Design a binder for this molecule. Structure first.
Ligand SMILES: Nc1ncnc2c1ncn2[C@@H]1O[C@H](COP(=O)(O)OP(=O)(O)OC[C@H]2O[C@H](O)[C@H](O)[C@@H]2O)[C@@H](O)[C@H]1O
Length: 185
Protein backbone atom coordinates (compact mmCIF):
# COMPACT_ATOMS: atom_id res chain seq x y z
CA UNK A 1 0.00 0.00 0.00
CA UNK A 2 1.36 3.43 -1.00
CA UNK A 3 -1.37 5.76 0.21
CA UNK A 4 -4.69 6.10 1.94
CA UNK A 5 -7.02 9.06 1.54
CA UNK A 6 -10.48 9.44 3.04
CA UNK A 7 -12.82 10.65 0.29
CA UNK A 8 -15.88 10.83 2.53
CA UNK A 9 -16.96 9.21 5.80
CA UNK A 10 -16.37 5.45 5.52
CA UNK A 11 -14.93 5.81 1.98
CA UNK A 12 -11.20 5.48 1.26
CA UNK A 13 -8.94 5.71 -1.74
CA UNK A 14 -6.02 3.26 -1.72
CA UNK A 15 -3.08 3.15 -4.05
CA UNK A 16 -1.40 -0.29 -4.10
CA UNK A 17 0.88 -2.48 -6.17
CA UNK A 18 -0.82 -5.68 -7.22
CA UNK A 19 -2.34 -8.00 -9.78
CA UNK A 20 -5.93 -7.18 -10.78
CA UNK A 21 -6.53 -10.87 -11.69
CA UNK A 22 -6.16 -11.76 -8.01
CA UNK A 23 -7.18 -9.12 -5.46
CA UNK A 24 -9.39 -9.49 -2.42
CA UNK A 25 -12.00 -6.99 -3.70
CA UNK A 26 -15.58 -7.34 -4.99
CA UNK A 27 -15.00 -6.27 -8.63
CA UNK A 28 -12.21 -4.98 -10.92
CA UNK A 29 -12.08 -2.66 -13.93
CA UNK A 30 -10.52 -3.87 -17.19
CA UNK A 31 -8.84 -1.44 -19.62
CA UNK A 32 -10.77 -2.64 -22.67
CA UNK A 33 -11.10 -1.73 -26.35
CA UNK A 34 -14.40 -1.04 -28.06
CA UNK A 35 -14.80 -4.68 -29.15
CA UNK A 36 -14.34 -6.18 -25.64
CA UNK A 37 -11.70 -8.23 -27.33
CA UNK A 38 -9.15 -8.92 -24.66
CA UNK A 39 -6.11 -9.76 -26.69
CA UNK A 40 -3.45 -7.46 -25.24
CA UNK A 41 -2.11 -5.97 -22.05
CA UNK A 42 -4.12 -6.15 -18.86
CA UNK A 43 -7.15 -7.34 -20.80
CA UNK A 44 -5.23 -10.44 -21.99
CA UNK A 45 -3.91 -11.33 -18.55
CA UNK A 46 -7.45 -11.04 -17.07
CA UNK A 47 -8.97 -13.06 -19.89
CA UNK A 48 -6.36 -15.81 -19.69
CA UNK A 49 -6.95 -16.36 -15.93
CA UNK A 50 -10.69 -16.14 -16.54
CA UNK A 51 -11.00 -18.85 -19.19
CA UNK A 52 -13.04 -18.36 -22.39
CA UNK A 53 -16.19 -17.72 -20.39
CA UNK A 54 -15.22 -14.03 -20.16
CA UNK A 55 -14.51 -13.46 -23.85
CA UNK A 56 -17.65 -15.41 -24.79
CA UNK A 57 -19.91 -13.43 -22.49
CA UNK A 58 -18.20 -10.32 -23.98
CA UNK A 59 -18.85 -11.46 -27.61
CA UNK A 60 -22.49 -12.05 -26.80
CA UNK A 61 -22.56 -8.61 -25.18
CA UNK A 62 -21.20 -6.86 -28.30
CA UNK A 63 -23.32 -9.16 -30.53
CA UNK A 64 -26.28 -7.96 -28.41
CA UNK A 65 -25.61 -4.29 -27.44
CA UNK A 66 -23.21 -3.43 -30.30
CA UNK A 67 -19.68 -2.02 -30.17
CA UNK A 68 -18.89 0.03 -27.05
CA UNK A 69 -17.94 3.64 -27.47
CA UNK A 70 -14.79 5.24 -25.85
CA UNK A 71 -15.74 6.75 -22.50
CA UNK A 72 -18.29 3.95 -21.84
CA UNK A 73 -18.09 0.86 -19.61
CA UNK A 74 -20.11 -2.30 -19.47
CA UNK A 75 -20.01 -5.36 -17.26
CA UNK A 76 -19.50 -9.03 -18.05
CA UNK A 77 -19.15 -12.34 -16.26
CA UNK A 78 -15.72 -12.87 -14.74
CA UNK A 79 -15.41 -16.57 -15.38
CA UNK A 80 -12.76 -18.25 -13.26
CA UNK A 81 -11.50 -14.91 -11.84
CA UNK A 82 -12.22 -14.42 -8.09
CA UNK A 83 -15.08 -12.00 -8.94
CA UNK A 84 -18.65 -12.33 -10.13
CA UNK A 85 -18.06 -9.53 -12.68
CA UNK A 86 -15.46 -7.55 -14.60
CA UNK A 87 -16.32 -3.96 -15.44
CA UNK A 88 -14.85 -3.22 -18.88
CA UNK A 89 -14.03 0.44 -19.34
CA UNK A 90 -13.02 1.73 -22.78
CA UNK A 91 -10.51 4.46 -22.31
CA UNK A 92 -9.80 6.89 -25.19
CA UNK A 93 -6.94 6.38 -27.60
CA UNK A 94 -4.78 9.40 -26.95
CA UNK A 95 -4.54 12.15 -29.60
CA UNK A 96 -2.50 15.27 -28.85
CA UNK A 97 -4.88 17.07 -31.22
CA UNK A 98 -7.85 16.43 -28.85
CA UNK A 99 -6.33 16.34 -25.35
CA UNK A 100 -9.33 17.92 -23.54
CA UNK A 101 -11.77 15.49 -25.20
CA UNK A 102 -9.40 12.62 -24.31
CA UNK A 103 -9.36 13.73 -20.62
CA UNK A 104 -13.18 13.99 -20.76
CA UNK A 105 -13.54 10.45 -22.05
CA UNK A 106 -11.19 8.90 -19.41
CA UNK A 107 -13.02 10.84 -16.66
CA UNK A 108 -16.21 9.41 -18.09
CA UNK A 109 -14.89 5.82 -18.29
CA UNK A 110 -13.90 6.12 -14.65
CA UNK A 111 -17.23 7.53 -13.45
CA UNK A 112 -19.32 4.99 -15.37
CA UNK A 113 -17.17 2.26 -13.87
CA UNK A 114 -18.00 3.63 -10.38
CA UNK A 115 -21.71 3.81 -11.27
CA UNK A 116 -21.77 0.16 -12.36
CA UNK A 117 -20.11 -0.87 -9.12
CA UNK A 118 -22.77 1.06 -7.09
CA UNK A 119 -25.51 -0.48 -9.19
CA UNK A 120 -24.36 -4.03 -8.55
CA UNK A 121 -23.99 -3.15 -4.80
CA UNK A 122 -20.26 -3.57 -4.60
CA UNK A 123 -18.37 -2.06 -1.73
CA UNK A 124 -14.89 -2.53 -3.13
CA UNK A 125 -13.52 -1.81 -6.65
CA UNK A 126 -9.97 -1.84 -8.16
CA UNK A 127 -9.05 0.31 -11.10
CA UNK A 128 -5.90 0.47 -13.29
CA UNK A 129 -4.24 3.27 -15.33
CA UNK A 130 -6.85 2.98 -18.07
CA UNK A 131 -5.53 4.15 -21.45
CA UNK A 132 -1.85 4.55 -20.34
CA UNK A 133 -0.56 1.46 -22.16
CA UNK A 134 -1.31 0.59 -25.78
CA UNK A 135 -3.83 3.55 -26.02
CA UNK A 136 -0.95 5.94 -25.28
CA UNK A 137 -2.39 8.36 -22.73
CA UNK A 138 0.49 10.33 -21.09
CA UNK A 139 1.00 8.56 -17.83
CA UNK A 140 1.09 11.70 -15.72
CA UNK A 141 -2.10 13.24 -17.22
CA UNK A 142 -3.64 9.76 -17.13
CA UNK A 143 -3.35 9.07 -13.38
CA UNK A 144 -4.33 12.64 -12.37
CA UNK A 145 -7.48 12.40 -14.53
CA UNK A 146 -8.47 9.13 -12.85
CA UNK A 147 -7.78 10.43 -9.33
CA UNK A 148 -9.60 13.73 -10.02
CA UNK A 149 -12.54 11.87 -11.55
CA UNK A 150 -12.71 9.85 -8.34
CA UNK A 151 -12.42 13.00 -6.21
CA UNK A 152 -15.36 14.72 -8.03
CA UNK A 153 -17.54 11.62 -7.64
CA UNK A 154 -17.42 12.20 -3.82
CA UNK A 155 -17.67 16.01 -3.68
CA UNK A 156 -20.76 14.97 -1.54
CA UNK A 157 -20.78 12.98 1.78
CA UNK A 158 -23.85 10.67 1.18
CA UNK A 159 -22.37 5.54 -1.25
CA UNK A 160 -22.26 1.71 -1.49
CA UNK A 161 -18.55 2.01 -2.25
CA UNK A 162 -16.31 2.07 0.84
CA UNK A 163 -12.95 1.19 -0.72
CA UNK A 164 -11.61 2.21 -4.10
CA UNK A 165 -8.25 0.84 -5.09
CA UNK A 166 -5.93 2.17 -7.75
CA UNK A 167 -3.68 -0.70 -8.79
CA UNK A 168 -0.90 -1.66 -11.18
CA UNK A 169 1.75 -4.45 -11.20
CA UNK A 170 4.53 -2.00 -12.06
CA UNK A 171 5.87 0.27 -9.36
CA UNK A 172 6.41 3.34 -11.61
CA UNK A 173 2.68 3.49 -12.39
CA UNK A 174 1.82 2.92 -8.77
CA UNK A 175 4.23 5.79 -7.82
CA UNK A 176 2.55 7.88 -10.50
CA UNK A 177 -0.82 7.15 -8.84
CA UNK A 178 0.57 8.08 -5.38
CA UNK A 179 1.96 11.37 -6.73
CA UNK A 180 -1.33 12.22 -8.45
CA UNK A 181 -3.09 11.68 -5.15
CA UNK A 182 -0.71 14.22 -3.47
CA UNK A 183 -1.12 16.80 -6.21
CA UNK A 184 -4.91 16.36 -6.42
CA UNK A 185 -5.61 16.41 -2.63
N1 LIG B 1 0.27 -8.30 -18.77
C1 LIG B 1 -0.08 -7.28 -17.98
N2 LIG B 1 -0.48 -7.56 -16.71
C2 LIG B 1 -0.86 -6.58 -15.87
N3 LIG B 1 -0.88 -5.29 -16.22
C3 LIG B 1 -0.49 -4.94 -17.46
C4 LIG B 1 -0.08 -5.91 -18.39
N4 LIG B 1 0.23 -5.24 -19.53
C5 LIG B 1 0.03 -3.93 -19.31
N5 LIG B 1 -0.41 -3.75 -18.05
C6 LIG B 1 -0.74 -2.47 -17.36
O1 LIG B 1 -2.14 -2.15 -17.34
C7 LIG B 1 -2.29 -0.71 -17.60
C8 LIG B 1 -3.22 -0.46 -18.83
O2 LIG B 1 -2.53 -0.78 -20.07
P1 LIG B 1 -3.23 -1.48 -21.31
O3 LIG B 1 -3.68 -2.81 -20.83
O4 LIG B 1 -2.33 -1.49 -22.50
O5 LIG B 1 -4.63 -0.48 -21.50
P2 LIG B 1 -4.97 0.73 -22.65
O6 LIG B 1 -3.66 1.41 -22.48
O7 LIG B 1 -6.20 1.10 -21.86
O8 LIG B 1 -5.06 -0.45 -23.68
C9 LIG B 1 -6.32 -0.92 -24.11
C10 LIG B 1 -6.05 -1.86 -25.25
O9 LIG B 1 -4.94 -2.65 -24.80
C11 LIG B 1 -5.29 -4.07 -24.99
O10 LIG B 1 -4.80 -4.28 -26.35
C12 LIG B 1 -6.82 -4.08 -24.82
O11 LIG B 1 -7.48 -5.24 -25.38
C13 LIG B 1 -7.15 -2.84 -25.66
O12 LIG B 1 -7.02 -3.14 -27.08
C14 LIG B 1 -0.86 -0.16 -17.79
O13 LIG B 1 -0.33 0.29 -16.56
C15 LIG B 1 -0.08 -1.39 -18.21
O14 LIG B 1 1.30 -1.30 -17.84
Amino acid sequence: CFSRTVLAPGVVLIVQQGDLARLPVDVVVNASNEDLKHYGGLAAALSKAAGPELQADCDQIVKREGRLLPGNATISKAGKLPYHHVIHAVGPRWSGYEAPRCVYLLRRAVQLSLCLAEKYKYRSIAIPAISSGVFGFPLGRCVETIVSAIKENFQFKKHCLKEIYLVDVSEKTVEAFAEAVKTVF
